[PDB]
Amino acid sequence: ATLKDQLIYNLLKEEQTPQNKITVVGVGAVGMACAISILMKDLADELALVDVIEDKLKGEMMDLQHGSLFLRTPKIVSGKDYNVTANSKLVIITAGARQQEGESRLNLVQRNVNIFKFIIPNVVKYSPNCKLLIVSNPVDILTYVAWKISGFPKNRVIGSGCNLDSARFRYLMGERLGVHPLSCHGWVLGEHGDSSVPVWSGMNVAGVSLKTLHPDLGTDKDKEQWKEVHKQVVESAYEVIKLKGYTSWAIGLSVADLAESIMKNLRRVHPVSTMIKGLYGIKDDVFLSVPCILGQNGISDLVKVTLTSEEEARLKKSADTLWGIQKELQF
Amino acid sequence: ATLKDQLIYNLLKEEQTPQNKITVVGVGAVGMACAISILMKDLADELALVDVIEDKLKGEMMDLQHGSLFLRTPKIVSGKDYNVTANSKLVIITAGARQQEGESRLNLVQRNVNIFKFIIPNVVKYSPNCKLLIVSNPVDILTYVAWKISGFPKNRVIGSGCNLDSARFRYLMGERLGVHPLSCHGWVLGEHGDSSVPVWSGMNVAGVSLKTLHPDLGTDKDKEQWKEVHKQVVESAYEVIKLKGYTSWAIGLSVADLAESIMKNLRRVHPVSTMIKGLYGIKDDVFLSVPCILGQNGISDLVKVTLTSEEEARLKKSADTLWGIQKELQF
Amino acid sequence: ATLKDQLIYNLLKEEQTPQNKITVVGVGAVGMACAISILMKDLADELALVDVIEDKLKGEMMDLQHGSLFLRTPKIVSGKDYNVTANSKLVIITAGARQQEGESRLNLVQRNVNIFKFIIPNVVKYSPNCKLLIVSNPVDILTYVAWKISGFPKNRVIGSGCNLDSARFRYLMGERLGVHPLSCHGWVLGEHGDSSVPVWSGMNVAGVSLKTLHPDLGTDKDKEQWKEVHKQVVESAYEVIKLKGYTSWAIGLSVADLAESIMKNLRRVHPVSTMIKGLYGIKDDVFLSVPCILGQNGISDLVKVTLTSEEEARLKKSADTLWGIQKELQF
Amino acid sequence: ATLKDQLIYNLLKEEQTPQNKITVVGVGAVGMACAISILMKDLADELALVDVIEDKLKGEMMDLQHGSLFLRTPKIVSGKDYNVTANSKLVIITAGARQQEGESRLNLVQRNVNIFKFIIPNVVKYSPNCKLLIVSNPVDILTYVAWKISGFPKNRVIGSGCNLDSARFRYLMGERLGVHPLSCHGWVLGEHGDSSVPVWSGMNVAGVSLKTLHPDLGTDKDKEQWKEVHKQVVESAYEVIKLKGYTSWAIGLSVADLAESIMKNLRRVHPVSTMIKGLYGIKDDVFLSVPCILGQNGISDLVKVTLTSEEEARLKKSADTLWGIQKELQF
Ligand SMILES: NC(=O)C1=CN([C@@H]2O[C@H](COP(=O)(O)OP(=O)(O)OC[C@H]3O[C@@H](n4cnc5c(N)ncnc54)[C@H](O)[C@@H]3O)[C@@H](O)[C@H]2O)C=CC1
Ligand SMILES: NC(=O)C1=CN([C@@H]2O[C@H](COP(=O)(O)OP(=O)(O)OC[C@H]3O[C@@H](n4cnc5c(N)ncnc54)[C@H](O)[C@@H]3O)[C@@H](O)[C@H]2O)C=CC1
Ligand SMILES: NC(=O)C1=CN([C@@H]2O[C@H](COP(=O)(O)OP(=O)(O)OC[C@H]3O[C@@H](n4cnc5c(N)ncnc54)[C@H](O)[C@@H]3O)[C@@H](O)[C@H]2O)C=CC1
Ligand SMILES: NC(=O)C1=CN([C@@H]2O[C@H](COP(=O)(O)OP(=O)(O)OC[C@H]3O[C@@H](n4cnc5c(N)ncnc54)[C@H](O)[C@@H]3O)[C@@H](O)[C@H]2O)C=CC1
């Protein structure tokens, strides 16, 4: 005889179970951007957030929940314990250790590895069938780490790899050609960051190859210096971090885009990081970005792009470096 | 023989005026939430951002540009100079000091009134015809301030006001009833702050008045203590602030909602702050929230909510404090 | 080797379980408006169509497919055999005779019950767990029929019922008020047809009772003749049929609206056809519209609207008319 | 006191300038498919419809209006009088005779020109600065006709052209490769009809040339027979017309795609009919489809595709046919 029972006659028993649920692990700037991007595209019927910093955590969930009136994601949960994560179709990992001067390289990744040693088994425990999307840097190596710890088949472990990189290149291409980024095509492949590969030959508007029309494209001997676009892609992140302290909006939109293909089983093609041992002369267990078909089973297929022998070596080189790092890691 | 000329044949050297342009002033946590919300709802063809911190400004502009590939707003610009703002349909003011843990919105007034005296005249010079949407706290007073300085008729100066408070209210109502906030209706009017008014008589689902079903609603002796919903609404800012340091996502979605009504001339009804002199008897030029019809000319109409004498006494009470602050003000 | 195989390396194979499949039975004018609306709101990952007219079926199927580039529904299938229907979460029934000019929906009952004998058993055989969304007229009776035939628990058999009449009501109220229909609240309940009942007491804007403000709302003496608004809702279908031969856009949009709450587990409240025995003096298995919570398990709850003795009498009358037809039925 | 006066306190009158108005001329199958797809993408703040058949026109308008609750387009009007179309940003012409089974679109010319002789002056009179989007067939000749009669600069006279043919092409391409159409690139250029030209050289996935992998692509030689994909494109309209009698959904989606780029000033690239005298060796005022940047001013730029030797001759032949027809046109 409460107000609720006087107002509502109940008919049904107890069968909840979110059908289309996503978890984001890490509520730093990247994680919440992914979160907001996912809420505003209606990708999920349940959103769960996890982090080890409890005050931050809860505060972010509340803020988001207070905007429910303007969303169509009817349940938003969070917490330090991975039970809130239960039965997620997709889990996005952004958590990472904060970097720091006064230490070199293996230190950084090993530290993140120590964190994934606790995060990963927790996620698989609660969502043994989910697809994993890794965003934490260095991304290609952490995707391998997530892949090894989890035990998942390679199709279900995906690193954001060069996805944003390629988005950046398309913005810059579009800005020069006075064309919208959707209509400028170009792929940034390989290792996310400094050693990424701009595949000039695939660069085009409307099917029209820019290399075929402008042979100097991507070389050092070109009056337009297109090579600069790619050097801008590599340096844009540092630039943004220098300017604002971190990047968030763009990687969030970027990750929402992947989530959409997967949640909705689109089979769109996106540059993401995948386990390519057995391709391009690559002989070790390493993750690099190639064009992958993304749907309800994660990466079900990838595109074999034809690469120049120079592009092959760049890839190979990255592979040897990631493997060198990886074989020194403590799991 | 440039690549661009070889690739693209130009028809129109010409270039039009900005048509569906929004400017956000202040790119802090609220400003950027508003920006991203706006961009994900396709509300504008041009987004302009202004701040006094240059590097932060450039950083946020670039991060947003980097996700252009996934958006549908082809022009994103920024600058310290208000020329980048010209011909904006809507200008959103999110700049100024924010609350520390426990601090009253009312303790921000002198320093935000200063800031406004420098911002507004610059906004007006470049967009004499825009609607002004004020978010900065204390929002009801700053809406009065924007109004006096700009010289705009009252229909074009809107305070985000109680649109957030009512959304929080519906969120909690919905959590109690197990119904989506879109289907739970209820209004919080007055000051966006401690002295806001829950109009118990309008709370309902499917048109059935909860007050009528349960006459103790909103009363001390209400065994269900619905009063507490209002008090959690009142307290929501502090709780979230003390948890993550500020609020942003909700006000972001809230602000996008108002923008949507304005840009698309929807004529929907929202609780926002407006000049209510000549209502509820109320005598002075005070701005506070009451439901308003919102559209291409801003606030074209006010809804006359029926209030009990207690409610009206609270509203007027709020009107009294607020005018006392404005009247003493600096400009 | 095949072009496909030189371009694409396959990791998995052809998995094929759709997670959010919708079926539309009947590709007439209503079926196809429901389809395109659903397609444009991204409610499904697979859409399947069926009809007995095979050439028409294929054409519609193909015309939607040719628009895939512009959609986010990656599989569209059709067939006269219900196997194309397998594993649907939501099956929408729009097949059957429709009203000629001036014709009562009730006059359609025997023809439509005759095709339901076949359609319902076939749909349940391939989607035993689906929710059933009935649209064919007379919609309340056919919801009862589908319920009796299928054996489904009543939470999973839903009539589109008065979502459309309420929407038309709010359109007309908004027109009189200069307010977007979204901010007008008004419920049309009971038979989707001539015996419908407008609930005067729940009509409001911003939570303010129009009836309390204007105590003659809904009455014969009312100078404003608001009762004319409901007459218009009652006549609306007839006027549209007389003008264009049938109706389709509004229903397509109403059905997509119900589908959305169901597929995204929103728990929004709509006026839909459901079993009302036990309420308002009704002692038989009558199906008509009452406000219900719609979510992933169909109707989970009913809002118990409070009615004036006049309002209730009218509703009980609508229930008698309906029962009077149901009882004679033989299927 | 009337309800409205009692409820709402008015601030001002004014009201006028529609901000983003679109008009559809012709409410047949095609026009309403355009109307609905535009309504569901929130591209306009006002939509006007016209037709010569008065009852049908009013009926469709009412049907759309009855769906207002589910839309964000606050005003829909219609009339046989073109004053209802005043100040449209975009006017879409779908009126006219359509193909019977097996009929060439070129056979409709004399019938549709006579219609355009009355229509174009009426549209331009009320909306002198609108962009005109032509859909009636034969769409390339009628775009030329609209251009001659209206006196508009060529940027503002656009034929929906091959946007649809290319969408068909990418749909079939994607079916063959197991990849979403969004991710399959390929262009169909020239006449929207039997003489269209598939540009094999620009066909690709992730920038990887299908023609380079598979040199016999598109010729009579290839065991894969890719040419049949283009034949299905040319034939698609007839097959569908035979099945269902006309086509409607894909064109409506195609047109809504174009409208989006025009209304939101996206500068995306589409194959649409435009004036190409001066290109590929063509010397008369022929309009046909090439990739064009579309934005707030219509077509601002064309993309110069590199066409193989065989492709240039086809286009020419295509231009010759059309011109031959044109030369004989009287107006
Ligand atoms: N792949 C790409 O293109 C991009 C990758 N990133 C990477 O994304 C990651 C996130 O960056 P930000 O959000 O700015 O960093 P952040 O430091 O603000 O976020 C990390 C969050 O994860 C939490 N965390 C740490 N260990 C955890 C664990 N044991 N379990 C759960 N939560 C844990 C932290 O408390 C923190 O809230 C960084 O590694 C960054 O390098 C950032 C931008 C782009
Ligand atoms: N109305 C409402 O419901 C709510 C209001 N707020 C208010 O929003 C305001 C900002 O909040 P946050 O964004 O978190 O603060 P913030 O510190 O993150 O950002 C404020 C921004 O304003 C900028 N700014 C200061 N003076 C300026 C001027 N002269 N011209 C241009 N930009 C200037 C600052 O540089 C800063 O980037 C505060 O007043 C806060 O109280 C916050 C939440 C809700
Ligand atoms: N509930 C509501 O608010 C509304 C309901 N309707 C009702 O929807 C129904 C359909 O209307 P329209 O689409 O305009 O009719 P329509 O005449 O345009 O199409 C009816 C379709 O049903 C198919 N059909 C007939 N028997 C079938 C069976 N055995 N199995 C599969 N398909 C079969 C026909 O082949 C045809 O394609 C009518 O009953 C009409 O009264 C119409 C508007 C609103
Ligand atoms: N370009 C493309 O990809 C496509 C073009 N079409 C063309 O679209 C056109 C429309 O076809 P439907 O909509 O299926 O035909 P429809 O027969 O369904 O409707 C044609 C409408 O135009 C109206 N109309 C006729 N004469 C008129 C005049 N003098 N002034 C104003 N309105 C007039 C009619 O009353 C009728 O309502 C046809 O020319 C068709 O070939 C159709 C599909 C695709």
Tab-separated table of N, CA, C and O in Angstrom, chain A residues 229-294:
chain	number	residue	atom	x	y	z
A	229	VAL	N	51.943	15.510	-43.271
A	229	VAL	CA	50.680	15.069	-42.701
A	229	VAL	C	50.962	13.985	-41.663
A	229	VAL	O	50.478	14.053	-40.536
A	230	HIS	N	51.755	12.988	-42.057
A	230	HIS	CA	52.066	11.883	-41.192
A	230	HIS	C	52.955	12.262	-40.023
A	230	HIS	O	52.811	11.732	-38.938
A	231	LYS	N	53.864	13.200	-40.237
A	231	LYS	CA	54.746	13.620	-39.170
A	231	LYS	C	53.645	14.419	-38.126
A	231	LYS	O	53.543	14.377	-37.221
A	232	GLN	N	52.714	15.143	-38.657
A	232	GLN	CA	51.674	15.771	-37.840
A	232	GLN	C	50.814	14.746	-37.080
A	232	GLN	O	50.462	14.957	-35.918
A	233	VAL	N	50.493	13.636	-37.728
A	233	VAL	CA	49.794	12.582	-37.025
A	233	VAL	C	50.608	12.111	-35.813
A	233	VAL	O	50.109	12.062	-34.710
A	234	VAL	N	51.879	11.792	-36.017
A	234	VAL	CA	52.701	11.332	-34.911
A	234	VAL	C	52.820	12.383	-33.806
A	234	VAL	O	52.702	12.051	-32.660
A	235	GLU	N	53.041	13.643	-34.166
A	235	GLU	CA	53.284	14.730	-33.211
A	235	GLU	C	52.037	15.445	-32.673
A	235	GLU	O	52.156	16.354	-31.832
A	236	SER	N	50.853	15.054	-33.144
A	236	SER	CA	49.630	15.770	-32.772
A	236	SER	C	49.231	15.455	-31.374
A	236	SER	O	48.706	16.324	-30.688
A	237	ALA	N	49.517	14.224	-30.954
A	237	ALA	CA	49.197	13.762	-29.611
A	237	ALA	C	50.075	14.461	-28.613
A	237	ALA	O	49.590	14.944	-27.580
A	238	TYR	N	51.371	14.542	-28.924
A	238	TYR	CA	52.287	15.236	-28.017
A	238	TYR	C	51.870	16.686	-27.914
A	238	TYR	O	51.904	17.289	-26.847
A	239	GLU	N	51.471	17.234	-29.049
A	239	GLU	CA	51.091	18.629	-29.136
A	239	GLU	C	49.889	18.888	-28.265
A	239	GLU	O	49.855	19.869	-27.532
A	240	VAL	N	48.899	18.004	-28.355
A	240	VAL	CA	47.668	18.182	-27.625
A	240	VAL	C	47.966	18.001	-26.126
A	240	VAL	O	47.477	18.769	-25.280
A	241	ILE	N	48.799	17.013	-25.804
A	241	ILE	CA	49.134	16.762	-24.410
A	241	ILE	C	49.886	17.929	-23.833
A	241	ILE	O	49.652	18.318	-22.692
A	242	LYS	N	50.749	18.529	-24.633
A	242	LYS	CA	51.472	19.693	-24.174
A	242	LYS	C	50.472	20.821	-23.937
A	242	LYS	O	50.604	21.597	-22.981
A	243	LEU	N	49.473	20.927	-24.803
A	243	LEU	CA	48.563	22.063	-24.744
A	243	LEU	C	47.525	21.968	-23.621
A	243	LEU	O	47.236	22.961	-22.949
A	244	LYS	N	46.945	20.775	-23.462
A	244	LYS	CA	45.872	20.583	-22.483
A	244	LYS	C	46.185	19.581	-21.374
A	244	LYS	O	45.472	19.508	-20.405
A	245	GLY	N	47.269	18.824	-21.508
A	245	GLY	CA	47.672	17.923	-20.458
A	245	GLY	C	47.347	16.497	-20.770
A	245	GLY	O	47.887	15.605	-20.129
A	246	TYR	N	46.496	16.265	-21.765
A	246	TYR	CA	46.067	14.910	-22.077
A	246	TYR	C	45.119	14.988	-23.265
A	246	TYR	O	44.698	16.102	-23.626
A	247	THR	N	44.766	13.853	-23.866
A	247	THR	CA	43.781	13.882	-24.938
A	247	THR	C	42.653	12.993	-24.518
A	247	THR	O	42.872	12.001	-23.808
A	248	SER	N	41.442	13.320	-24.961
A	248	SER	CA	40.292	12.528	-24.541
A	248	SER	C	39.162	12.459	-25.561
A	248	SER	O	38.764	11.361	-25.965
A	249	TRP	N	38.625	13.614	-25.942
A	249	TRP	CA	37.514	13.647	-26.880
A	249	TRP	C	37.714	12.758	-28.081
A	249	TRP	O	36.922	11.862	-28.361
A	250	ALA	N	38.813	12.958	-28.776
A	250	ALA	CA	38.990	12.219	-30.004
A	250	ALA	C	39.149	10.715	-29.836
A	250	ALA	O	38.612	9.962	-30.601
A	251	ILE	N	39.831	10.260	-28.806
A	251	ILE	CA	40.031	8.827	-28.628
A	251	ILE	C	38.721	8.243	-28.183
A	251	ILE	O	38.384	7.132	-28.553
A	252	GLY	N	37.940	9.011	-27.419
A	252	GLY	CA	36.623	8.550	-27.015
A	252	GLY	C	35.698	8.309	-28.231
A	252	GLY	O	35.111	7.210	-28.368
A	253	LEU	N	35.585	9.309	-29.111
A	253	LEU	CA	34.749	9.169	-30.300
A	253	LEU	C	35.260	7.984	-31.089
A	253	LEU	O	34.508	7.114	-31.493
A	254	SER	N	36.572	7.895	-31.184
A	254	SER	CA	37.216	6.794	-31.893
A	254	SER	C	36.817	5.419	-31.355
A	254	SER	O	36.545	4.453	-32.100
A	255	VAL	N	36.836	5.302	-30.039
A	255	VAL	CA	36.488	4.034	-29.433
A	255	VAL	C	34.982	3.786	-29.518
A	255	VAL	O	34.550	2.652	-29.605
A	256	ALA	N	34.176	4.835	-29.481
A	256	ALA	CA	32.732	4.634	-29.605
A	256	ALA	C	32.436	4.016	-30.994
A	256	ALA	O	31.572	3.124	-31.152
A	257	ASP	N	33.211	4.469	-31.980
A	257	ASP	CA	33.052	3.998	-33.350
A	257	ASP	C	33.339	2.503	-33.458
A	257	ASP	O	32.532	1.756	-34.012
A	258	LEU	N	34.440	2.032	-32.870
A	258	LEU	CA	34.699	0.589	-32.849
A	258	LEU	C	33.544	-0.172	-32.153
A	258	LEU	O	33.072	-1.218	-32.629
A	259	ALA	N	33.110	0.357	-31.007
A	259	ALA	CA	32.090	-0.306	-30.183
A	259	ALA	C	30.826	-0.500	-31.019
A	259	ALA	O	30.169	-1.553	-31.065
A	260	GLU	N	30.466	0.562	-31.681
A	260	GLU	CA	29.350	0.463	-32.582
A	260	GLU	C	29.491	-0.699	-33.592
A	260	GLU	O	28.551	-1.473	-33.750
A	261	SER	N	30.619	-0.822	-34.302
A	261	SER	CA	30.686	-1.955	-35.252
A	261	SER	C	30.480	-3.284	-34.556
A	261	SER	O	29.761	-4.146	-35.055
A	262	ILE	N	31.116	-3.415	-33.385
A	262	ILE	CA	31.055	-4.655	-32.631
A	262	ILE	C	29.670	-4.808	-32.036
A	262	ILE	O	29.012	-5.767	-32.320
A	263	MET	N	29.192	-3.853	-31.243
A	263	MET	CA	27.889	-4.089	-30.649
A	263	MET	C	26.859	-4.398	-31.716
A	263	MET	O	25.953	-5.196	-31.478
A	264	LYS	N	26.959	-3.763	-32.882
A	264	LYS	CA	25.903	-3.927	-33.860
A	264	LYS	C	26.300	-4.908	-34.963
A	264	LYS	O	25.580	-5.034	-35.954
A	265	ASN	N	27.451	-5.559	-34.827
A	265	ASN	CA	27.885	-6.526	-35.832
A	265	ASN	C	27.870	-5.965	-37.239
A	265	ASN	O	27.323	-6.582	-38.143
A	266	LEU	N	28.465	-4.783	-37.425
A	266	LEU	CA	28.465	-4.077	-38.718
A	266	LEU	C	29.350	-4.724	-39.787
A	266	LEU	O	29.016	-4.685	-40.972
A	267	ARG	N	30.483	-5.283	-39.383
A	267	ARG	CA	31.485	-5.743	-40.349
A	267	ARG	C	32.064	-4.551	-41.156
A	267	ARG	O	32.255	-4.668	-42.359
A	268	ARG	N	32.345	-3.452	-40.450
A	268	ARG	CA	33.000	-2.334	-41.049
A	268	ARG	C	34.469	-2.601	-40.944
A	268	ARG	O	34.900	-3.460	-40.151
A	269	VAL	N	35.251	-1.863	-41.721
A	269	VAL	CA	36.672	-2.078	-41.683
A	269	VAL	C	37.313	-0.913	-40.944
A	269	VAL	O	36.987	0.247	-41.190
A	270	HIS	N	38.186	-1.242	-40.002
A	270	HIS	CA	38.824	-0.249	-39.156
A	270	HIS	C	40.260	-0.695	-38.931
A	270	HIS	O	40.514	-1.894	-38.769
A	271	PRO	N	41.165	0.256	-38.796
A	271	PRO	CA	42.560	-0.057	-38.501
A	271	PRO	C	42.684	-0.315	-37.009
A	271	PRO	O	42.642	0.658	-36.238
A	272	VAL	N	42.833	-1.563	-36.573
A	272	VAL	CA	43.003	-1.809	-35.151
A	272	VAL	C	44.141	-2.795	-35.015
A	272	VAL	O	44.587	-3.373	-35.989
A	273	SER	N	44.585	-3.024	-33.788
A	273	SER	CA	45.761	-3.846	-33.553
A	273	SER	C	45.309	-5.284	-33.331
A	273	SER	O	44.418	-5.538	-32.505
A	274	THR	N	45.918	-6.210	-34.074
A	274	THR	CA	45.572	-7.617	-34.003
A	274	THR	C	46.843	-8.509	-34.070
A	274	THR	O	47.937	-8.046	-34.393
A	275	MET	N	46.703	-9.772	-33.691
A	275	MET	CA	47.817	-10.686	-33.595
A	275	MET	C	48.149	-11.188	-34.995
A	275	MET	O	47.510	-12.102	-35.462
A	276	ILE	N	49.141	-10.585	-35.662
A	276	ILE	CA	49.466	-10.880	-37.060
A	276	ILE	C	50.611	-11.832	-37.326
A	276	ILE	O	51.150	-11.833	-38.442
A	277	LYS	N	51.033	-12.599	-36.331
A	277	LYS	CA	52.042	-13.628	-36.611
A	277	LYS	C	51.506	-14.450	-37.776
A	277	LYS	O	50.356	-14.925	-37.753
A	278	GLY	N	52.330	-14.596	-38.801
A	278	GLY	CA	51.926	-15.368	-39.956
A	278	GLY	C	51.625	-14.505	-41.186
A	278	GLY	O	51.197	-15.043	-42.194
A	279	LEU	N	51.907	-13.196	-41.101
A	279	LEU	CA	51.614	-12.220	-42.152
A	279	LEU	C	52.725	-11.160	-42.278
A	279	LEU	O	53.381	-10.830	-41.296
A	280	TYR	N	52.942	-10.644	-43.491
A	280	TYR	CA	54.016	-9.673	-43.757
A	280	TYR	C	55.387	-10.046	-43.236
A	280	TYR	O	56.135	-9.183	-42.773
A	281	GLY	N	55.736	-11.319	-43.328
A	281	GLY	CA	57.051	-11.730	-42.891
A	281	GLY	C	57.180	-11.737	-41.377
A	281	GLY	O	58.219	-12.148	-40.851
A	282	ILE	N	56.130	-11.303	-40.677
A	282	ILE	CA	56.137	-11.298	-39.213
A	282	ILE	C	56.089	-12.697	-38.565
A	282	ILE	O	55.134	-13.475	-38.738
A	283	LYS	N	57.134	-12.988	-37.797
A	283	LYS	CA	57.322	-14.315	-37.200
A	283	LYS	C	57.069	-14.506	-35.704
A	283	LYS	O	57.108	-15.644	-35.204
A	284	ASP	N	56.764	-13.433	-34.986
A	284	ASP	CA	56.497	-13.579	-33.549
A	284	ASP	C	55.051	-13.275	-33.126
A	284	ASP	O	54.223	-12.879	-33.948
A	285	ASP	N	54.735	-13.489	-31.841
A	285	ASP	CA	53.416	-13.145	-31.350
A	285	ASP	C	53.404	-11.653	-31.032
A	285	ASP	O	53.766	-11.240	-29.933
A	286	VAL	N	52.999	-10.840	-31.989
A	286	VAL	CA	52.900	-9.432	-31.733
A	286	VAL	C	51.621	-8.868	-32.341
A	286	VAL	O	51.028	-9.451	-33.276
A	287	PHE	N	51.199	-7.734	-31.798
A	287	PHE	CA	49.987	-7.052	-32.265
A	287	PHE	C	50.311	-5.797	-33.073
A	287	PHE	O	51.010	-4.904	-32.592
A	288	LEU	N	49.847	-5.754	-34.321
A	288	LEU	CA	49.980	-4.532	-35.145
A	288	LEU	C	48.640	-4.167	-35.804
A	288	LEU	O	47.721	-5.009	-35.929
A	289	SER	N	48.494	-2.909	-36.192
A	289	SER	CA	47.257	-2.516	-36.824
A	289	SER	C	47.222	-2.801	-38.339
A	289	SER	O	48.080	-2.382	-39.102
A	290	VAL	N	46.216	-3.535	-38.754
A	290	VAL	CA	45.930	-3.708	-40.154
A	290	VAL	C	44.430	-3.474	-40.198
A	290	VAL	O	43.787	-3.374	-39.143
A	291	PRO	N	43.871	-3.318	-41.385
A	291	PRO	CA	42.410	-3.156	-41.549
A	291	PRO	C	41.657	-4.415	-41.172
A	291	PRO	O	41.792	-5.456	-41.858
A	292	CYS	N	40.854	-4.325	-40.117
A	292	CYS	CA	40.119	-5.484	-39.622
A	292	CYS	C	38.620	-5.320	-39.741
A	292	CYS	O	38.058	-4.261	-39.473
A	293	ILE	N	37.976	-6.413	-40.085
A	293	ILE	CA	36.544	-6.467	-40.154
A	293	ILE	C	36.052	-6.736	-38.734
A	293	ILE	O	36.472	-7.663	-38.079
A	294	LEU	N	35.171	-5.879	-38.262
A	294	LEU	CA	34.783	-5.882	-36.863
A	294	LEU	C	33.290	-6.096	-36.775
A	294	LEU	O	32.539	-5.447	-37.481
